[PDB]
Design a protein around this motif. Structure first.
Motif, PDB file in Angstrom:
ATOM      1  N   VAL A 150     -18.937 -43.077  21.784  1.00 58.84           N
ATOM      2  CA  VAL A 150     -20.396 -43.006  21.780  1.00 58.84           C
ATOM      3  C   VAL A 150     -20.912 -42.731  23.185  1.00 58.84           C
ATOM      4  O   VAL A 150     -21.833 -41.927  23.381  1.00 58.84           O
ATOM      5  CB  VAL A 150     -20.982 -44.304  21.193  1.00 58.84           C
ATOM      6  N   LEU A 197     -28.135 -39.577  18.072  1.00 62.25           N
ATOM      7  CA  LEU A 197     -28.727 -39.375  16.757  1.00 62.25           C
ATOM      8  C   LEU A 197     -27.955 -38.364  15.914  1.00 62.25           C
ATOM      9  O   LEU A 197     -27.251 -37.490  16.422  1.00 62.25           O
ATOM     10  CB  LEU A 197     -30.178 -38.913  16.886  1.00 62.25           C
ATOM     11  N   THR A 216     -28.831 -51.338  23.015  1.00 63.07           N
ATOM     12  CA  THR A 216     -27.714 -50.427  22.821  1.00 63.07           C
ATOM     13  C   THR A 216     -28.088 -49.048  23.347  1.00 63.07           C
ATOM     14  O   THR A 216     -29.224 -48.804  23.757  1.00 63.07           O
ATOM     15  CB  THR A 216     -27.303 -50.329  21.347  1.00 63.07           C
ATOM     16  N   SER A 244     -31.655 -39.177  21.483  1.00 66.62           N
ATOM     17  CA  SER A 244     -30.997 -40.341  22.067  1.00 66.62           C
ATOM     18  C   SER A 244     -31.944 -41.529  22.037  1.00 66.62           C
ATOM     19  O   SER A 244     -33.082 -41.420  22.497  1.00 66.62           O
ATOM     20  CB  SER A 244     -30.570 -40.066  23.504  1.00 66.62           C
ATOM     21  N   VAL A 245     -31.472 -42.660  21.518  1.00 71.44           N
ATOM     22  CA  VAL A 245     -32.239 -43.902  21.481  1.00 71.44           C
ATOM     23  C   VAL A 245     -31.663 -44.856  22.513  1.00 71.44           C
ATOM     24  O   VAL A 245     -30.489 -45.235  22.429  1.00 71.44           O
ATOM     25  CB  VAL A 245     -32.221 -44.556  20.093  1.00 71.44           C
ATOM     26  N   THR A 258     -29.120 -43.355  13.305  1.00 75.98           N
ATOM     27  CA  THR A 258     -28.101 -43.355  14.342  1.00 75.98           C
ATOM     28  C   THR A 258     -26.925 -42.487  13.872  1.00 75.98           C
ATOM     29  O   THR A 258     -26.781 -42.205  12.682  1.00 75.98           O
ATOM     30  CB  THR A 258     -27.713 -44.821  14.628  1.00 75.98           C
ATOM     31  N   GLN A 259     -26.138 -41.985  14.832  1.00 71.61           N
ATOM     32  CA  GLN A 259     -24.935 -41.225  14.504  1.00 71.61           C
ATOM     33  C   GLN A 259     -23.920 -42.073  13.748  1.00 71.61           C
ATOM     34  O   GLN A 259     -23.222 -41.575  12.857  1.00 71.61           O
ATOM     35  CB  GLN A 259     -24.310 -40.668  15.783  1.00 71.61           C
ATOM     36  N   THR A 260     -23.838 -43.362  14.066  1.00 70.45           N
ATOM     37  CA  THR A 260     -22.799 -44.235  13.528  1.00 70.45           C
ATOM     38  C   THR A 260     -23.420 -45.301  12.613  1.00 70.45           C
ATOM     39  O   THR A 260     -22.929 -46.421  12.478  1.00 70.45           O
ATOM     40  CB  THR A 260     -21.983 -44.816  14.690  1.00 70.45           C
ATOM     41  N   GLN A 276     -27.610 -45.480  21.833  1.00 76.22           N
ATOM     42  CA  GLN A 276     -27.074 -44.720  20.719  1.00 76.22           C
ATOM     43  C   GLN A 276     -27.612 -43.297  20.709  1.00 76.22           C
ATOM     44  O   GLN A 276     -28.571 -42.955  21.403  1.00 76.22           O
ATOM     45  CB  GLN A 276     -27.375 -45.413  19.393  1.00 76.22           C
ATOM     46  N   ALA A 303     -27.289 -46.823  10.885  1.00 74.08           N
ATOM     47  CA  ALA A 303     -28.732 -46.923  11.034  1.00 74.08           C
ATOM     48  C   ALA A 303     -29.060 -48.316  11.538  1.00 74.08           C
ATOM     49  O   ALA A 303     -28.210 -49.209  11.487  1.00 74.08           O
ATOM     50  CB  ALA A 303     -29.451 -46.642   9.714  1.00 74.08           C
ATOM     51  N   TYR A 309     -23.132 -39.605  24.673  1.00 74.69           N
ATOM     52  CA  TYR A 309     -24.413 -39.904  25.301  1.00 74.69           C
ATOM     53  C   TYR A 309     -24.467 -39.401  26.739  1.00 74.69           C
ATOM     54  O   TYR A 309     -25.488 -38.851  27.170  1.00 74.69           O
ATOM     55  CB  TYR A 309     -24.684 -41.407  25.252  1.00 74.69           C
TER      56      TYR A 309
END
Lengths: 132, 54, 48, 41, 72, 223, 72, 72, 72, 72
Positions: free
Chosen positions: B36, A45, A41, A68-69, A27-29, A43, A31, B40
């Motif tokens: 965030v 990447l 969520t 993107s997740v 994740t960007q922020t 999140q 894991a 996104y």
């Protein structure tokens, strides 16, 4: 259990409606770990490897670049990524040389945002070597 | 397009603003902040154009 | 927030650079698939 | 021959490592207070 | 003077055995914030709590013998 | 009023027998072979070094790597002389506070004189942390120097005080078994407490990581 | 006269362990929320639970060292 | 001299229960952040706080019973 | 001397509310960082933080109740 | 001997004001991190801090109030 894992590049598709119990995403922020019912969520990447653990005895070591997740309300995820390649298409030898050359231009950057562009480039090659 | 013969001109919306994407259906969701969700909601603008272009 | 934030950048401008580095670490065999995507063909026309 | 096996090591780091004089001074002064308390019993 | 000396060494030792209650507040309490991110419940998650719950009580029932060591 | 514990009053004696035999003895537990393939009992000693020589090497990465071939001798001595003493009637030299004040000070003052022979200004200009504000210069450089001279005392006294603290609970929980000629059910539970506590007293290896490592940080920071 | 002073100086010395009765309560409660995020327990995350435990019990038991010396 | 020991003993033995409340605020202060991250209230989360109040108070309320036998 | 034992005990048992004083300071340190993530305020976010306060301060208040019996 | 029981009850009761001073570091620590999510600060985000700060100090002053009763 009762999950759905989707993993698609723009040009190719890895997984469609086939889930295996655990997904590891950088994740960007931080894991996270997906374990059959994670609190959902939205999140985005960072450069880093995705190691999907297949049921199937073994794992699957992919390496995304920026995607993107989206894990959602029902137990189903949608991991979409831009450059999702495996490990053997990459060469470690060119990845060693690309690091310090971008460190050499870091001191030679006069502007404040052009130097900020250089800080993006050194981070991606740093996760390149340590994944190898 | 539906087939070789018949297509259809269609319509799809783009929720680009962060605060219209800040409603009752996102308070159920997790630790996503306005930074965030800023990153996104931009990326889904590039995924609706690539859907439209194909 | 990071260094690409608070300096005046966008996440596409982030995602262009970190995906470009993966296309430079590829071998000679899979360099054509980095040439395949390579999406710099759209021109820019603003009337002023 | 407990010397020339490690003689290249000694004058490398005993320049700072062989400062037991501070240990000798903090030891020798620590001798003095215990002979003095038994003198006054 | 005998029963005077014994008891105020015994009560002042039993303060330390509620000094480990403030740890299992964190041990049993920080299971909450872990369980909500991921519901892999009967995994090592609840069992790591028992490695917390009975090791932090193992400093709780540590001093309680030492109090009864100076009862007698 | 079911289970009455007992106690025995007896002096707990850290005597001082003939030491210069006892110091030399954990040297001859480790042999050294002049052969290519070795004999499967040195070979698991030789592997155990090549692990933890790759963790006191990685941080420094300088021409201060010359110092690091000594620091793995410092870990095997008090790694052994803390592990020998768990035996029935053995004697540990790192119990007494004497030699540990000779292990700290000739090593700790070997660090502050390392940068003072090469740098001569910026070794203890590490007392200047940041982009100096005004109201707290005298509140800082009386604090960060009183937490420098604590370090030799902070390095030796942390080793002697908990090593001997392991030995007393070995005796006192053990001695309460012998004097437990009252009800025989509770004798086993004190015995089962012992054989757990002897597993915890193989943290005498764990307390040598926290002696070589805070010697590296007290070397890496100065140099 | 000092027979009570043998006791309370030992009876007050024991409550200095009451920190580390809670200090290991942190490091086991703080591990499960380090684990539910990232299930890689066989890596160095569990190895920092024991070294954090041992370095806390190193400052745990030797507070009872000064307890017995005042007694014996 | 017996009276001068019974009253200092129990008041010393009451000190520890301060350790209990200082952890028992955490076990509801983790459930506030627990439910506000995933509304799983009626399931197993809230019942853990019912166990969490019941457990750490048993480390606390026994220390009060220690004070009574010094008083009686 | 008989009145002196009254005075020494309650000032010792006074301090058992010190931790229960900080045991309510963290249950409000959650609802700041709890609400700022899910504005569902007037519902059971605030209604639970009410219950955690009155339960914990009562266990501090009972520690003051024994201070009066040592006093009287 | 009549003066000496005044000062132990003075010294030991004042100890408990330390605990509530630890609590208001939490609630003012937590308002810094709650604001950094959601800048709705001048609303009930900051107002819950002055809710909590007054409620923890009320316990600590309640500890300090017995210091003026038992001394006098």
């Amino acid at each position: 259990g009762q999950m759905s894992f989707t993993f698609a590049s723009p040009t190719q598709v890895f997984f469609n409606g086939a889930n295996v119990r655990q997904v590891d995403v950088p994740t960007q922020t931080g894991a996270f770990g997906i374990l059959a019912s994670h609190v959902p969520t939205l999140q985005v990447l960072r450069p880093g490897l995705v190691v999907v653990h297949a049921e199937d005895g073994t794992t699957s070591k992919y390496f995304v670049s920026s995607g993107s997740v989206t894990v959602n309300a029902d137990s189903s995820v949608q991991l979409l990524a831009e450059e999702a390649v495996t490990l053997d298409m990459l060469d470690p030898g060119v990845a060693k040389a690309n690091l310090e050359k971008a460190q050499s231009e870091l001191l030679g950057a006069a502007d404040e945002a052009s130097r900020a562009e250089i800080q993006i480039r050194i981070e991606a090659n740093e996760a390149l070597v340590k994944a190898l | 397009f539906r087939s070789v013969i018949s297509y259809k001109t269609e319509e799809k919306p783009i929720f680009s603003l962060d605060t219209v994407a800040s409603a009752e259906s996102m308070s159920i969701y997790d630790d996503i902040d306005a930074d965030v969700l800023r990153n996104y909601q931009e990326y889904s603008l590039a995924n609706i154009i690539y859907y439209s272009l194909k | 927030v990071a260094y690409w934030r608070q300096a005046g950048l966008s996440y596409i401008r982030y995602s262009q650079i970190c995906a470009k580095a993966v296309r430079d670490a590829l071998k000679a065999e899979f360099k054509a698939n980095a040439e395949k995507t390579s999406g710099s063909n759209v021109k820019i026309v603003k009337v002023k | 021959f407990q010397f020339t096996g490690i003689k290249k090591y000694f004058n490398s780091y005993t320049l700072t490592g062989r400062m037991n004089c501070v240990l000798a001074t903090y030891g020798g002064i620590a001798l003095l207070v215990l002979y003095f308390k038994l003198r006054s019993k | 003077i005998d029963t005077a000396a014994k008891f105020i060494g015994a009560g002042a030792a039993t303060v330390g055995v509620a000094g480990s209650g403030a740890g299992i507040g964190t041990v049993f309490g920080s299971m909450i914030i872990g369980y909500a991110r991921n519901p892999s419940l009967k995994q090592q998650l609840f069992s790591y709590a028992i490695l917390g719950f009975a090791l932090s009580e193992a400093m709780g029932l540590f001093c309680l013998m030492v109090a009864f060591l100076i009862l007698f | 009023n079911e289970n009455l514990f007992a106690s025995f009053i007896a002096p707990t004696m850290m005597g001082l027998p003939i030491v210069t035999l006892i110091i030399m003895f954990p040297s001859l537990l480790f042999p050294t072979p002049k052969r290519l393939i070795n004999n499967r009992t040195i070979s698991i000693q030789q592997w155990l070094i090549q692990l933890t020589s790759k963790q006191m090497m990685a941080i420094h990465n300088q021409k201060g790597q010359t110092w690091s071939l000594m620091l793995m001798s410092l870990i095997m001595f008090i790694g052994s002389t803390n592990i020998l003493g768990l035996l029935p009637h053995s004697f540990t030299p790192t119990t007494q506070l004497s030699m540990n004040l000779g292990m700290a000070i000739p090593l700790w003052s070997a660090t502050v004189f390392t940068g003072f022979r090469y740098k001569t200004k910026t070794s203890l200009a590490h007392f200047l942390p940041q982009g100096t504000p005004a109201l707290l210069i005298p509140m800082l450089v009386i604090i960060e120097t009183i937490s420098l001279f604590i370090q030799p005392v902070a390095l030796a006294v942390r080793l002697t005080a908990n090593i001997t603290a392991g030995h007393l609970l070995i005796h006192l929980i053990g001695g309460a078994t012998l004097a437990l000629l009252n009800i025989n059910t509770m004798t086993a539970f004190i015995t089962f407490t012992i054989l757990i506590l002897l597993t915890i007293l193989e943290f005498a290896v764990a307390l040598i990581q926290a002696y070589v490592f805070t010697l590296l940080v007290s070397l890496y920071l100065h140099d």
